[PDB]
Amino acid sequence: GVEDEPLLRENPIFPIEYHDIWQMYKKAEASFWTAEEVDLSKDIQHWESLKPEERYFISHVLAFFAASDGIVNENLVERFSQEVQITEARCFYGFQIAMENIHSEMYSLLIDTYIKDPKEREFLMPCVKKKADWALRWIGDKEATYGERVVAFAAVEGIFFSGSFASIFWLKKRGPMPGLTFSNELISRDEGLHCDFACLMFKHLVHKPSEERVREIIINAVRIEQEFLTEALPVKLIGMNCTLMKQYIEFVADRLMLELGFSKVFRVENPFDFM
Amino acid sequence: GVEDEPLLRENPIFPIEYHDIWQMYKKAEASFWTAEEVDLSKDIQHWESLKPEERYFISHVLAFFAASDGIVNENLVERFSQEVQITEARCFYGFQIAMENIHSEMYSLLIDTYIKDPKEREFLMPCVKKKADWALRWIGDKEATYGERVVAFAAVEGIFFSGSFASIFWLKKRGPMPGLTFSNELISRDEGLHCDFACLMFKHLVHKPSEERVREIIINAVRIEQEFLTEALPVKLIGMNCTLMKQYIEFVADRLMLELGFSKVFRVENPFDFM
Ligand SMILES: [Fe+3]
Numbered sequence: 055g056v057e058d059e060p061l062l063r064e065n066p067i068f069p070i071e072y073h074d075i076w077q078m079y080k081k082a083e084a085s086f087w088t089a090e091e092v093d094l095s096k097d098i099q100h101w102e103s104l105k106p107e108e109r110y111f112i113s114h115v116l117a118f119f120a121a122s123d124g125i126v127n128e129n130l131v132e133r134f135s136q137e138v139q140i141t142e143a144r145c146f147y148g149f150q151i152a153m154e155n156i157h158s159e160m161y162s163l164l165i166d167t168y169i170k171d172p173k174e175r176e177f178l179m180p181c182v183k184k185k186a187d188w189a190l191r192w193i194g195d196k197e198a199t200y201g202e203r204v205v206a207f208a209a210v211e212g213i214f215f216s217g218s219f220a221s222i223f224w225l226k227k228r229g230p231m232p233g234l235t236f237s238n239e240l241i242s243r244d245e246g247l248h249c250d251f252a253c254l255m256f257k258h259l260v261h262k263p264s265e266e267r268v269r270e271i272i273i274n275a276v277r278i279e280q281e282f283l284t285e286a287l288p289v290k291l292i293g294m295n296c297t298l299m300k301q302y303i304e305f306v307a308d309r310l311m312l313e314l315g316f317s318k319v320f321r322v323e324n325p326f327d328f329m
Numbered sequence: 330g331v332e333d334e335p336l337l338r339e340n341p342i343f344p345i346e347y348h349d350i351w352q353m354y355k356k357a358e359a360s361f362w363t364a365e366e367v368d369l370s371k372d373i374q375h376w377e378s379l380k381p382e383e384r385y386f387i388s389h390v391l392a393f394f395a396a397s398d399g400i401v402n403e404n405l406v407e408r409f410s411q412e413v414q415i416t417e418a419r420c421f422y423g424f425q426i427a428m429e430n431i432h433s434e435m436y437s438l439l440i441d442t443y444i445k446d447p448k449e450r451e452f453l454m455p456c457v458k459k460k461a462d463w464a465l466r467w468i469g470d471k472e473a474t475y476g477e478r479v480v481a482f483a484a485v486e487g488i489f490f491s492g493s494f495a496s497i498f499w500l501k502k503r504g505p506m507p508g509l510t511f512s513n514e515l516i517s518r519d520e521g522l523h524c525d526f527a528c529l530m531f532k533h534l535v536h537k538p539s540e541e542r543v544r545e546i547i548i549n550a551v552r553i554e555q556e557f558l559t560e561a562l563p564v565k566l567i568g569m570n571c572t573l574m575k576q577y578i579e580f581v582a583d584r585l586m587l588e589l590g591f592s593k594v595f596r597v598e599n600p601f602d603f604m
């Protein structure tokens with residue numbers, strides 16, 4: 055029933071029809087940044103002073119972020135930006151793809167700098183790919199509605215990285231590593247705005263999935279993220295409490311629900327007062 | 330015969346396989362700019378001091394540039410960036426789409442500033458759309474090879490605007506209009522790099538059209554551009570010699586041929602020593 059969707063139906067570019075969308079493109083635009091603005095010189099001095107558990111962890115979280123912004127960008131290219139046929143939402147998606155490419159680079163500048171041997175670089179991982187069946191499936195499914203798929207990538211960019219951004223912010227106070235922590239600040243701000251944008255699109259969608267459907271996608275997204283940070287790569291390795299991290303995930307997942315216009319599912323407070 | 334094309338065949342992102350491509354993305358990246366960096370305040374003072382032939386002309390050239398970067402960007406979205414399946418050429422196309430959106434905006438900031446009444450804004454035009462059958466056809470044709478279609482948009486971004494960029498550069502010395510002339514400097518630099526990139530892709534294409542095919546696309550592109558500037562909207566209106574403009578087109582069209590790796594077709598010198 056796509057004819058009834060203002061967002062998706064075909065149409066006849068500074069007569070601004072969608073101010074809320076446009077205001078976010080210019081917000082994304084105004085936060086432009088490139089890898090070379092992030093000084094990584096002063097880092098190996100700190101990476102050297104780390105524990106070895108703190109390196110198996112930081113290296114792995116960086117590597118999960120490599121196999122992550124590539125799936126986000128494979129979806130906006132060959133699905134989202136094709137479908138959405140209104141002008142303002144295409145500029146944003148156009149700018150988003152540009153930044154997802156810079157994020158992808160930044161993570162690789164980091165991994166090249168913290169790992170000089172290519173044989174190490176090769177794990178990619180049965181550790182990480184738990185989300186493939188959830189994620190890459192919402193690229194691959196031809197029955198998945200736009201509405202389901204918008205909520206889906208709201209979850210990827212807002213739940214799935216949330217813990218990892220929390221980790222780097224935790225390391226940052228304990229103490230610095232300006233490459234990791236300055237990139238992370240910029241990258242976590244970008245993902246918030248992308249995640250907010252996914253929400254704005256949802257709001258403009260007449261036909262959306264039932265609450266139970268939206269809850270399912272999010273609840274399930276959270277469990278997979280909780281599993282990654284408490285078992286597959288415990289934030290224990292860098293001195294953090296698992297329970298608190300499982301709980302932060304849920305705070306973030308609830309904050310998404312409120313923003314998609316639905317009720318809290320978990321009701322937990324934010325455990326981390328730095329976030 | 331797409332399996333034999335390194336550029337197009339499927340494949341397994343900072344192991345840099347294509348340095349020449351990457352070096353251009355970072356060149357595009359480093360030349361990032363947004364509309365708000367172009368001060369349009371100081372312009373109506375000069376637009377006021379124009380002749381009325383100089384306004385029917387500048388307004389129309391701006392309007393041709395509105396119905397122009399929209400077709401360039403409709404091709405990279407729903408054709409080019411889909412097909413090209415190598416990493417470096419996707420970042421560039423990703424960054425290109427971002428800038429084509431900013432160009433499209435800039436032209437609209439200009440037209441809104443030089444034309445306060447929307448009833449004027451409405452011509453779009455049987456004047457302009459001569460290229461549709463040539464251009465939008467190379468979006469619409471499912472028989473057109475990549476090679477033909479890469480040369481095609483090399484022509485759009487390098488021939489089709491060339492005269493118009495020449496006009497604004499001519500006005501600039503006679504004298505200023507910093508909005509028009511600063512935008513134009515930035516926009517004509519972007520189109521040169523996009524046009525150079527189209528050339529770099531052509532070079533990396535095993536299977537390309539015969540010289541006669543390449544000559545046809547370019548020769549025909551030139552005639553349509555020559556027609557626009559000497560009949561449909563003569564650069565006479567702003568005091569310029571038609572013959573010289575017909576000849577500049579040909580200098581530019583020859584400079585494209587040399588860069589696609591072929592012989593000159595016209596052998597003319599550059600008539601305009603400001604270009
Ligand atoms: Fe993102």
Ligand SMILES: [Fe+3]
Pocket residue numbers: 401429486519520523
């Ligand atoms: Fe261009």
